[PDB]
């Protein structure tokens, strides 16, 4: 589930197999790559369900976002983070899952 590339000004990205549960032991990568000057916003939509833990932030499965030297996350749980204004035109999204659990995953739209 790596090398997913999005080059249109707007689009939709999901965890593998969404809206069904994502696969175990996944290390997925997604790239949004736009021309210079564009500034991408990421906004989650629909159900957001990434395995979490009640005491510790995201120790099992997580989504992380990187743009240049900027890093957001990790994120997990039953509620998506607030929309992310990346202020950037080229973004990498990483999604890791461990070897157990049944959770639905995530869906986001991006725009610039």
């Amino acid at each position: 589930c790596s090398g997913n590339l999005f080059t249109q000004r707007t689009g939709t990205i999901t965890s593998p197999d969404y809206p069904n549960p994502y696969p175990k032991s996944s290390e997925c990568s997604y790239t949004i790559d736009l021309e210079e000057g564009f500034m991408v916003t990421l906004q989650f939509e629909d159900i957001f369900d990434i395995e979490d833990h009640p005491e510790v932030p995201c120790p099992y499965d997580y989504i992380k976002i990187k743009a240049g030297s900027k890093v957001w996350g990790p994120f997990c749980g039953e509620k998506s983070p607030e929309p992310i204004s990346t202020q950037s035109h080229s973004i990498q999204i990483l999604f890791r899952s461990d070897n157990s659990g049944e959770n639905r995953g995530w869906r986001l739209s991006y725009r610039a």
Binding site: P54, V56, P59
Partner: peptide, 27 residues
């Protein structure tokens, strides 16, 4: 009727104890 389906997995384990202190620094 027959017994039901097995129950769901239990809740996750607790956070482990902290690790040991690091090695000493320059003297």
């Amino acid at each position: 009727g027959p017994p039901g389906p097995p129950g769901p997995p239990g809740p996750p384990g607790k956070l482990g104890p902290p690790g040991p202190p690091g090695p000493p620094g320059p003297p």
